[PDB]
Amino acid sequence: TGRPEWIWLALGTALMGLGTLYFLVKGMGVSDPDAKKFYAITTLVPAIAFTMYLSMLLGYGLTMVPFGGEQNPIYWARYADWLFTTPLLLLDLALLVDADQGTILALVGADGIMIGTGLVGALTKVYSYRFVWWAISTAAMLYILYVLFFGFTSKAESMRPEVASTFKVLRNVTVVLWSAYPVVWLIGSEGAGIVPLNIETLLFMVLDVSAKVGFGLILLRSRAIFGEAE
Amino acid sequence: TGRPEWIWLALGTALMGLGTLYFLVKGMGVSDPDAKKFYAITTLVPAIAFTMYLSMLLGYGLTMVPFGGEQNPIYWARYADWLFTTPLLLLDLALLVDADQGTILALVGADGIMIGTGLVGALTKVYSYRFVWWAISTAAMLYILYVLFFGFTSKAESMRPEVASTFKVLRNVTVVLWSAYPVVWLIGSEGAGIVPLNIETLLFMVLDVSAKVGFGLILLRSRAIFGEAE
Amino acid sequence: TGRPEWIWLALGTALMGLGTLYFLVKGMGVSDPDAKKFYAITTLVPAIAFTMYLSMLLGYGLTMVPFGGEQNPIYWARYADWLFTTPLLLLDLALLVDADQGTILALVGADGIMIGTGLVGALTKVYSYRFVWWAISTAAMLYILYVLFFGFTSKAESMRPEVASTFKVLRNVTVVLWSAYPVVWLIGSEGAGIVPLNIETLLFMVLDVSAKVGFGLILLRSRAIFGEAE
Ligand SMILES: CC(C)CCC[C@@H](C)CCC[C@H](C)CCC[C@H](C)CCO[C@H](CO)COCC[C@H](C)CCC[C@@H](C)CCC[C@@H](C)CCCC(C)C
Ligand SMILES: CC(C)CCC[C@@H](C)CCC[C@H](C)CCC[C@H](C)CCO[C@H](CO)COCC[C@H](C)CCC[C@@H](C)CCC[C@@H](C)CCCC(C)C
Ligand SMILES: CC(C)CCC[C@@H](C)CCC[C@H](C)CCC[C@H](C)CCO[C@H](CO)COCC[C@H](C)CCC[C@@H](C)CCC[C@@H](C)CCCC(C)C
Ligand SMILES: *C\C=C(C)/C=C/C=C(C)/C=C/C1=C(C)CCCC1(C)C
Ligand SMILES: *C\C=C(C)/C=C/C=C(C)/C=C/C1=C(C)CCCC1(C)C
Numbered sequence: 001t002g003r004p005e006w007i008w009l010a011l012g013t014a015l016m017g018l019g020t021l022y023f024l025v026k027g028m029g030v031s032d033p034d035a036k037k038f039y040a041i042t043t044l045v046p047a048i049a050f051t052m053y054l055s056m057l058l059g060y061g062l063t064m065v066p067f068g069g070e071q072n073p074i075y076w077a078r079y080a081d082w083l084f085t086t087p088l089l090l091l092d093l094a095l096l097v098d099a100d101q102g103t104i105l106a107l108v109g110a111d112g113i114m115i116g117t118g119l120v121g122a123l124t125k126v127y128s129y130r131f132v133w134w135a136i137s138t139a140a141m142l143y144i145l146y147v148l149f150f151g152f153t154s155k156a157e158s159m160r161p162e163v164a165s166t167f168k169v170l171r172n173v174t175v176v177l178w179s180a181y182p183v184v185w186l187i188g189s190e191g192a193g194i195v196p197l198n199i200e201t202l203l204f205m206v207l208d209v210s211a212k213v214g215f216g217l218i219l220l221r222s223r224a225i226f227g228e229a230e
Numbered sequence: 231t232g233r234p235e236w237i238w239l240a241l242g243t244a245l246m247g248l249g250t251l252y253f254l255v256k257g258m259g260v261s262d263p264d265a266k267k268f269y270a271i272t273t274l275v276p277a278i279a280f281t282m283y284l285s286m287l288l289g290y291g292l293t294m295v296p297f298g299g300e301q302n303p304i305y306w307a308r309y310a311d312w313l314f315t316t317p318l319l320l321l322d323l324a325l326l327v328d329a330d331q332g333t334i335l336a337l338v339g340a341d342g343i344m345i346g347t348g349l350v351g352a353l354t355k356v357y358s359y360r361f362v363w364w365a366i367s368t369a370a371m372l373y374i375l376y377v378l379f380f381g382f383t384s385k386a387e388s389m390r391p392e393v394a395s396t397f398k399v400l401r402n403v404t405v406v407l408w409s410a411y412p413v414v415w416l417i418g419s420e421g422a423g424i425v426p427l428n429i430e431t432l433l434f435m436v437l438d439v440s441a442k443v444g445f446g447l448i449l450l451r452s453r454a455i456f457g458e459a460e
Numbered sequence: 461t462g463r464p465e466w467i468w469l470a471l472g473t474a475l476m477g478l479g480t481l482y483f484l485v486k487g488m489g490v491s492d493p494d495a496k497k498f499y500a501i502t503t504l505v506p507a508i509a510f511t512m513y514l515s516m517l518l519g520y521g522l523t524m525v526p527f528g529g530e531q532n533p534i535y536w537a538r539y540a541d542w543l544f545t546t547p548l549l550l551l552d553l554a555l556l557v558d559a560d561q562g563t564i565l566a567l568v569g570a571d572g573i574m575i576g577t578g579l580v581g582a583l584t585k586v587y588s589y590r591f592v593w594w595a596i597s598t599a600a601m602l603y604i605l606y607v608l609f610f611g612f613t614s615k616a617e618s619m620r621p622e623v624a625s626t627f628k629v630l631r632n633v634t635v636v637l638w639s640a641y642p643v644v645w646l647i648g649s650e651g652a653g654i655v656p657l658n659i660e661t662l663l664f665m666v667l668d669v670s671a672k673v674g675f676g677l678i679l680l681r682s683r684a685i686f687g688e689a690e
């Protein structure tokens with residue numbers, strides 16, 4: 001409790017933990033192989049996020065980075081989380097639309113570049129260079145958002161109506177929430193330092209819970225996750 | 231030789247090295263694509279374990295973690311090994327029974343959470359919190375063991391008799407040997423410190439060789455790894 | 461500019477950056493799913509290499525390792541690059557010949573062992589032991605080259621002529637360029653220290669650009685990357 005951001009970390013932990021348990025319970029019983037894929041991916045996302053929120057809460061996922069003449073507290077565990085959870089979120093979207101394997105590789109690959117360069121920016125000791133990594137990461141993000149809107153063209157023809165409507169809602173959720181992440185980082189403790197760490201942590205907790213648990217609720221309540229069957 | 235556990239590390243290295251070479255030689259010649267998968271996975275497991283045993287032997291895979299007021303020697307390389315070898319062992323089991331892809335994702339994902347939280351517990355400097363990570367890791371392990379017993383139901387109907395009988399033996403080996411790992415960690419150098427590092431290393435070497443080389447011998451001697459063919 | 465090797469790092473960065481943009485532009489428009497796979501993989505390789513060249517250029521990807529009584533500047537970011545880019549290059553080759561999944565696992569697995577042991581050797585503080593890791597890594601490399609020449613036998617029968625001819629050229633490029641890497645490391649700053657870091661960096665930049673951008677140009681200009689279609 002010695003760090004004012006503790007409360008949001010605690011709340012993040014709880015909410016990811018409850019979402020994990022809810023999805024685990026919800027997917028008990030499902031037999032449809034397509035649904036099984038979506039439950040697995042979607043349950044793992046908040047399970048991973050639970051562990052990394054806990055790690056931040058306990059202090060393990062925090063480090064001090066010198067830059068601007070100071071020791072800046074940097075929560076590195078967020079990158080360990082997103083390294084796995086963001087390709088998993090993309091896979092859910094990808095599977096929904098039956099994406100080509102080349103498209104899934106491009107998405108997962110650009111996403112790893114996004115998170116890996118954000119991690120490098122987060123740990124960089126030359127203040128100005130932190131923003132170069134931020135720009136490159138942001139370019140990888142723009143690429144991903146591009147592909148999510150303009151890369152699933154040949155799939156329109158043969159998309160069930162429910163699949164298309166759940167994909168569009170999840171795609172919109174994804175595009176609005178993920179785009180806030182470079183902005184928060186840029187104004188927050190990792191960037192310009194205009195928004196204090198405690199508010200930054202609040203923002204990230206609200207975005208993370210929405211993009212993971214919120215996203216998963218929408219998905220796992222849709223019939224789009226089942227094969228079409230009599 | 232300055233650390234009494236050196237001998238078990240040396241023996242571990244040798245045994246993983248010999249098992250690797252045996253499996254490499256044994257799979258030379260195989261053409262059946264299904265068998266090829268099982269040889270690959272099964273040869274990589276002890277090859278990876280060889281490198282990480284060597285790293286412990288040479289001192290590279292050892293670190294000192296402060297906790298309980300002391301510098302505790304923690305072999306971190308075990309987590310680098312298991313991070314890859316335990317999903318590979320699970321994949322062998324998964325492929326045997328033709329598991330659904332959602333099931334394989336759940337297994338590999340829970341296994342990464344098991345090893346990643348064990349690594350966090352192993353490196354945590356607040357003694358009491360080490361056991362929180364141990365509990366979470368152990369919960370992920372229980373999940374995996376659950377899935378291995380109750381998640382391959384729809385597959386019974388259409389399982390060749392030899393596949394079912396090799397899977398059950400390998401599943402039993404897996405469940406008994408993997409369950410010892412949280413116990414050894416808990417009583418050993420990473421946990422309560424009741425069993426000294428040198429005996430802890432002996433235990434881990436005996437379990438690892440059995441679960442990897444022992445497991446692989448059973449598997450690679452079965453006809454369950456070949457497609458059914460005239 | 462304080463390190464004489466800066467210029468090759470800068471040039472490496474530029475060339476990987478331009479190759480990335482060229483391949484991105486070149487693959488815009490492609491619809492053939494098989495081609496899409498090859499573009500994705502092949503565009504990601506220099507994109508990843510761009511980020512890690514930049515990281516070396518900026519100083520983030522450099523560390524000092526004590527050995528031989530000295531602080532040796534070791535560029536660790538090369539291993540972060542190759543950890544992903546070399547399995548991706550192998551996948552391009554693998555997909556060309558429609559390799560069995562067991563073969564792809566063996567290749568990707570041996571490649572991870574190659575890079576992971578090279579990383580361990582690069583960071584090892586006992587000078588003599590660095591070369592043990594070099595030998596093990598080199599053995600994994602020889603295995604890969606073996607598989608690339610003698611592991612795609614059953615595939616000859618049913619290989620389009622263009623696929624076979626592009627695969628052979630790319631396989632030859634791969635075998636000559638990758639084999640230089642253990643030699644450069646062995647004589648360079650990570651090994652015997654016979655070739656200074658600045659020339660070592662030049663060598664690695666010339667090899668990397670050739671094996672990634674050079675390789676990708678050959679591939680992406682071939683018709684072997686398209687499904688056979690009327
Ligand atoms: C958020 C992100 C940026 C992360 C993206 C990926 C990322 C984790 C990249 C990592 C590369 C790298 C470790 C960088 C090192 C930085 C540093 C200064 C040093 C590290 O940190 C330390 C310092 O003490 C130890 O590293 C050396 C040991 C290794 C970390 C582990 C070695 C593993 C291998 C030798 C065994 C072989 C593994 C494979 C066979 C796996 C293949 C899968 C298959 C079987 C299917
Ligand atoms: C046993 C376990 C817990 C491990 C489970 C996974 C684990 C390795 C998670 C790692 C996340 C993370 C690095 C945590 C950092 C902790 C620390 C304090 C800092 C690190 O350690 C150091 C400190 O000096 C360096 O890190 C920063 C650089 C990176 C490690 C590497 C960057 C890679 C990228 C920028 C390039 C893009 C890669 C992708 C394109 C890959 C996608 C595959 C595709 C092409 C198919
Ligand atoms: C070039 C190479 C050698 C690299 C090859 C692979 C390599 C990166 C191996 C890494 C293992 C390991 C971290 C070694 C540690 C060395 C060191 C001394 C300590 C580390 O470095 C630091 C020190 O401060 C932090 O580590 C601990 C935290 C972890 C790094 C991250 C934890 C992740 C998890 C707890 C969450 C679960 C993840 C999975 C669910 C992913 C599964 C995918 C799925 C969902 C499909
Ligand atoms: C799991 C929850 C979400 C939505 C995760 C998203 C992570 C990103 C979209 C990260 C983006 C970054 C960019 C684009 C620029 C650098 C800093 C980040 C790594 C935060
Ligand atoms: C390769 C050999 C085997 C059987 C590896 C197994 C590793 C585990 C089952 C690890 C389990 C752990 C748990 C469940 C609790 C924390 C400590 C561990 C990481 C050792």
Ligand SMILES: *C\C=C(C)/C=C/C=C(C)/C=C/C1=C(C)CCCC1(C)C
Nearest residue numbers: 578597598601638641642645668671
């Ligand atoms: C991306 C460009 C290329 C060709 C990368 C290749 C990397 C290798 C072939 C690395 C080999 C190593 C060996 C075999 C021995 C130890 C040192 C290395 C890691 C450099």
